C-alpha cells in the first residue's frame, strides 16, 4: 500500500498469571453508572455505559456474569446511600476495586474530579490521599469510612469461581492476539498538518501507541458494540521541527510491537 507496517515479535509474554481484576464504578448522576472490569494488562473486557449499553466480546456469555453483576448492583446501592447521606449533592464519584482472587485481596480506590481521595487496603486502614474541592460541610472521617467500599464479600465468597472465569477470559484474549489480524491506517491532513494513526482490533489489550523519536502525541482508545476496539493517535507535524520522517510505534503487553509509517 502507501504505508508499511513492520511487526516485531521477540517472545510472547503470558499476561494471565497473578490475575488481578479491576472492578470500576462511576456514578455520573441519578441511576447513571458506568461499570467496567479489566485485567492488569487488558483494556475493558466488560463495560456497562451509563446509557445502559452493554459492551463485551462475543466469546463472553454475559448471562453467566451473575456474581460481578451482583457486585455492581451493590455498588449502585452503596454509592447512592453514600452520596445522599454524606455529600447531599450528586457530584460524580468513582470507586475502583483492584482484586487478586488467589490469594484473595482487594485494594479500593475512591476518586472525585480527577483526584484520588482514599486508598483502602485490608492490612492497612483507609489512607487519605486527598480532599474534594467543594466539600466544606463533609468530614474527612466520613470520606475515609466510605473509602472502605462495599460488597467485597460477593467477590471473596466467590473467589475460586471468579479466578476460573477470568483466567479463561484472559487465556481467550492471549489466544486471539495476533498483530496480523488487526487493521492499521494513517491519515494525513494537508490543510492543518496533522497525521493520525489508527489500529482497529478485537483483542482488548492495554496497547501503547507512541512515536519512535519520543515526540508527544495525543492518543486514546474507543470501545464499540460488537467486541470492536480502536487505538488512535494524533501527530502535529511541526512538532517534528521541519522533519518529515516519523514512525508510530504500537506495543502490546504480550510482547510484540508494530511500526507504522510512510515509505517510498
Amino acid at each position: 500500500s502507501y504505508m508499511d507496517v513492520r511487526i516485531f515479535e521477540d517472545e510472547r509474554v503470558d499476561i494471565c498469571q497473578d490475575l488481578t481484576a479491576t472492578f470500576i464504578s462511576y456514578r455520573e448522576g441519578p441511576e447513571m453508572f458506568r461499570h467496567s472490569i479489566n485485567l492488569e494488562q487488558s483494556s475493558d473486557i466488560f463495560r456497562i455505559e451509563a446509557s445502559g449499553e452493554v459492551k463485551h466480546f462475543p466469546w463472553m456469555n454475559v448471562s453467566e456474569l451473575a456474581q460481578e453483576s451482583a457486585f455492581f448492583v451493590e455498588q449502585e446501592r452503596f454509592v447512592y446511600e453514600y452520596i445522599m447521606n454524606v455529600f447531599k449533592a450528586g457530584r460524580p464519584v468513582v470507586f475502583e476495586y483492584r482484586c487478586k482472587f488467589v490469594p484473595f485481596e482487594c485494594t479500593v480506590l475512591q476518586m472525585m474530579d480527577g483526584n484520588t481521595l482514599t486508598r483502602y487496603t485490608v492490612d492497612k486502614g483507609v489512607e487519605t490521599l486527598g480532599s474534594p474541592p467543594y466539600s466544606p460541610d463533609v468530614s474527612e472521617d466520613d470520606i475515609a469510612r466510605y473509602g472502605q467500599g462495599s460488597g467485597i464479600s460477593i467477590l471473596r465468597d466467590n473467589a475460586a469461581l471468579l479466578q476460573k472465569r477470568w483466567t479463561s477470559f484472559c487465556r481467550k484474549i492471549v489466544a486471539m492476539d495476533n498483530p496480523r489480524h488487526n487493521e492499521y491506517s494513517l491519515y494525513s491532513n494537508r490543510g492543518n498538518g496533522y497525521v493520525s494513526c489508527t489500529m482497529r482490533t478485537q483483542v482488548p489489550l492495554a496497547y501503547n501507541i507512541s512515536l519512535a523519536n519520543g515526540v508527544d502525541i495525543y492518543k486514546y482508545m474507543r470501545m464499540y458494540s460488537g467486541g470492536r476496539l480502536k487505538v488512535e493517535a494524533w501527530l502535529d507535524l511541526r512538532d517534528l521541527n521541519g522533519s518529515t520522517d516519523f514512525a508510530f510505534v504500537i506495543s502490546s503487553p504480550t510482547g510484540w510491537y508494530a511500526t507504522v509509517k510512510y515509505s517510498e
Partner: protein, 162 residues
C-alpha cells in the same frame, strides 16, 4: 452560517437540580447530539462519533473547574462554565474549530485551534486562561476534538447546503 456548533454547560449539581454537565451539538436547528449526566442518518453518525469525545471533555472540564482558583462573582461558590465550539471558524485559512469559554460571566477566553492561539477579553481573564493554557491534555483534547470526527462532520456539513 451552517457549521457545527457545540454548547457545553458545566455547573455545580444541587439536590433540586442534579445536573452538572450538558452538551448540545447543532447544525443549524437540527440537533446532532444531546448529552447530560441526568440522562443519555448522517446526523446519527456524527452524533455517535462525537459522543465519547464530548463526554470525556465535559468530565475533564469539570475536573479543571473544580481544581482551579476563581474568586470573582465574589467567590460566590462553585463557578458556572459555558463553552461554545464552532467549526468551521469564518476567519480560518484551513477549516478549524474555535473554543469559547465563559466562566461565571466574569472570565472570557477563546482558543483558536488553527494557530494554537489563545485570547482573553481582559487581564483577569488572561490569568485563568494561561493556567488552562498549560494543561497539555486539555489543549490536545480541544485540538483533536474535530479531527477525530472530521470526515463524518465535513461530509455532513456538505450535505446540508443541499
Amino acid at each position: 452560517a451552517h457549521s457545527l456548533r457545540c454548547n457545553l454547560t458545566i455547573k455545580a449539581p444541587t439536590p433540586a437540580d442534579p445536573l452538572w454537565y450538558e452538551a448540545k451539538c447543532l447544525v443549524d436547528e437540527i440537533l446532532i447530539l444531546h448529552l447530560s449526566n441526568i440522562n443519555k442518518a448522517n446526523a446519527t453518525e456524527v452524533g455517535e462519533c462525537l459522543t465519547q469525545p464530548v463526554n470525556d471533555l465535559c468530565q475533564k472540564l469539570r475536573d479543571k473547574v473544580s481544581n482551579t482558583k476563581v474568586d470573582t462573582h465574589k467567590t460566590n461558590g462553585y463557578p458556572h462554565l459555558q463553552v461554545t465550539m464552532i467549526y468551521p471558524q469564518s476567519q480560518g485559512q484551513t477549516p478549524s474549530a474555535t473554543w469559547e469559554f465563559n466562566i461565571s460571566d466574569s472570565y472570557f477566553f477563546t482558543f483558536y485551534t488553527e494557530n494554537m492561539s489563545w485570547r482573553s477579553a481582559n487581564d483577569e481573564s488572561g490569568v485563568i486562561m494561561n493556567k488552562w493554557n498549560d494543561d497539555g491534555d486539555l489543549v490536545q483534547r480541544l485540538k483533536y476534538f474535530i479531527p477525530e470526527c472530521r470526515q463524518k462532520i465535513d461530509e455532513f456539513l456538505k450535505q446540508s447546503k443541499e
